[PDB]
Design a protein around this nucleic acid. Sequence first.
DNA 1: TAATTCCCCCCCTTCGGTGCTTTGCACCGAAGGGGGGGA
Lengths: 393, 538
Amino acid sequence: TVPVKLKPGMDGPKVKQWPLTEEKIKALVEICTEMEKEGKISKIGPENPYNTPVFAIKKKDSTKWRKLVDFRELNKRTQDHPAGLKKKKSVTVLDVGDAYFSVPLDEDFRKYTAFTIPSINNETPGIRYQYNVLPQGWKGSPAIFQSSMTKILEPFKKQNPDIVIYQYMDDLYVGSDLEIGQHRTKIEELRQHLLRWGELHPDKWTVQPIVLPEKDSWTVNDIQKLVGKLNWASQIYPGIKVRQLCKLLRGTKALTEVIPLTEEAELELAENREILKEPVHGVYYDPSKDLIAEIQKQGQGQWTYQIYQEPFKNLKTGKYARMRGAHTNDVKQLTEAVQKITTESIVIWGKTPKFKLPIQKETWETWWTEYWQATWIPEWEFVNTPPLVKLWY
Amino acid sequence: PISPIETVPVKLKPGMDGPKVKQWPLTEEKIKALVEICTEMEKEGKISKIGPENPYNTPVFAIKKKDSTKWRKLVDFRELNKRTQDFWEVQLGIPHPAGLKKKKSVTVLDVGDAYFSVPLDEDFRKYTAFTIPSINNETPGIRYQYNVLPQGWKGSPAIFQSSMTKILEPFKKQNPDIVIYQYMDDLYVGSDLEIGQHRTKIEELRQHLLRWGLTTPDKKHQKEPPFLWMGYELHPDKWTVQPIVLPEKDSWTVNDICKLVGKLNWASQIYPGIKVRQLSKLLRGTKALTEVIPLTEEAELELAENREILKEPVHGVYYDPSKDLIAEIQKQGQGQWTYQIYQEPFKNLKTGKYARMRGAHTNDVKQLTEAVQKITTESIVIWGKTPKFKLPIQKETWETWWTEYWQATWIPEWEFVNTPPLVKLWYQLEKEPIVGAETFYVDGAANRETKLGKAGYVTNKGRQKVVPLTNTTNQKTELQAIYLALQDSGLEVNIVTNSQYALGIIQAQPDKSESELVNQIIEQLIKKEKVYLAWVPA
DNA sequence: TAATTCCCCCCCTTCGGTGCTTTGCACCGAAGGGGGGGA
Ligand SMILES: Nc1ncnc2c1ncn2[C@H]1C[C@H](O)[C@@H](COP(=O)(O)OP(=O)(O)OP(=O)(O)O)O1
Ligand SMILES: [Mg+2]
Ligand SMILES: [Mg+2]
């Protein structure tokens, strides 16, 4: 529906292309020949000064390749929520990206959707294409098919006004409160309805509290480890004094010396435990500000993450345990954790988060495409300094 | 002749008119050659005479053409380049002979007058006007404009590359069993056919090229081995680089050092063991590129070793997709590494080195990971796959490093090879306090105005020592206090600090640094037997 | 003098950004300079 126009003052994407492997190159060439043959893309020349990267991914249990375009710089330069999806037994995601390849794109705008395919050993200069139809990945592409979308799943929606469906990018999140053998049947009926006309469990999500250590005997080192935690926790939870636990930390003593706890200190410790078992009060979601997601590595295939909009005001805290590449591959686990966090964030709030990845840049850019299996790409930045003692979470 | 290929439409940036730069006085020997070349081009129709209806002008000049008695005519189009719209380049790298495969027949071809065979957009021809000044003095000057792609313009190479690809595609469609490498106008053709049937295919390719207005003169048509291609000499079963000549002088300037370092870097792709760090350190702090630089003793040794390395004939081999890629890494010390990529023992596909220093503080494991990543990326461009690594690090060392590191890191399929020196970590910090050792509560503060500070400590037994400092910042007194604790203690020691900066530096287990204080602390940490570091809020 | 353009690599230097609290010190990342190679 004639997308038209970029953001005022912006120019367009000018991102270079990263090298690929032989299998990805072969798959991309095979896909692009067929795509050009059907009029979806057209060859262009060097007079177009815009470019975006592309690559390929093999979807799980399908034994076929899919082509992905990094349309992240185009989205930020382009001009122009169901709060019941989190409370749902079973939620399924379906691919509806193949629908966009029938609506043509505006003649004025298709110059911005340019990409280049490299060659092995630089035997030939790269081949360039541009899109003639709506592409998969752009933020303005689903916002055009939306008016036509409001009418496709209506013969399935008004029949049962209990199922909640919400669309992000090329993905359809559908949720009900049916049994795992009947929700699947309803999803199959939806699949059939889609075919003729042209498994998540959100209720098992919980926050991760902050736990103070429990012990019978406390050394000077143990008390020092605790006061350093209470001082940091006082930022999130105003009202913690931690002024009697530091009174028995006066003077120079051996780190392994046992200090008996004063009853006043015991009362203070119990009260501070009590003020740590309750949720933080005074945190709300601002729809205008952006989300930030921090990830910390805990070892033995364990990771922790925090989602917040303002510092010390956490919207969500969680922990991820490994299942693939067990204590053998770290980039694989980090990629899976990033995908899981992004999926969780789209179901709530609605905006994808910006990640503070605890990795070096070069290794991530080298190996992240070998395990990615989603169709969206969140924006991310890399941290370099050690975060902290990292035992807060 | 001129190709019948379509022209690429180009335009100027909004608000810009066009160059009007006058021509600088040219020398007579250059003027005569320019006049002759222009007369021939006008006879062939590559340039057009222009009159008083064109207000634009741009200076022209000429240079010599490699190993020939001919001239190359160039135009200084810097202003037009400034006002010309932006392009996207399509050349993304250079082919490498190690990525080639063994073929039974090979031919190398070159196109004569490459740029002058591609037309230029008609509406853009008025901005390319130039004038050829008269010999000494006579006429005001003959003014021309370009009908084809000029040499010196920012858009010519991409246009020519795209046009050449467009021309070549139909022939490659009908002959999928013939390998063609194209770089600008240079063509390498390889086939598994007999020589008699290879010559006929080459003649058909030449006729196809001629039908599009591109000529391939017999002077630059190579038919017998060895073949000169992209700076390499290709033989039926091996390849090598064209001869590399190193300057041999007694007085060295900064420019000579720069050129020698560049030549050694170029030669390090097939000759194993090239080191340039000792020569490269001399470039720091120097300003003028004509200043005599006295060679040190660590640089003369490097030069003598590299000179001996290049005295032996060294060749590579071609790629065999039916076998495995093996990359073996060795350490040379002082943050330098070498690597060899091969498929069969003692037959290198290629060699290389890595000597980048990233970060203020590092150890041997991080540099090894960086080298592995660089080799992985390079092997994907040339061969499209990742090789098997032979690393001089024990599996237990890597296992105990990557599990306790706060970042995420990985190394592809690799196995340990026992070749000294090995990679290892030189000290480890205790996870629990040591029972029966001093505590050493240290502290250090400084004043930001007078830039003065102090760094002291105190222990549980009762020992104290205070040392005033000068010309130090706030985050240096903490390191000095930690060093004081490490110095005035025994072999096993607990340490309690108030600073996260020093603790974060120390916990990464560095062994080299750009700071002398950190280098002192590293040696004091290696010296001790059991160390525990603890942090406490102020 | 002496004059040009595009691409790949290496090595050294400046300045901007960030962000921890230390409001400017310390660390990192891009762009620019020099050199090599190709056309
Ligand atoms: N120094 C240079 N400046 C600008 N363009 C150049 C330069 N060297 C080469 N090129 C470009 C323009 C040439 O037409 C093209 C091919 O180079 P080359 O084959 O050496 O010359 P050529 O094809 O013009 O003449 P020849 O008849 O000798 O082959 O590369
Ligand atoms: Mg040539
Ligand atoms: Mg030529």
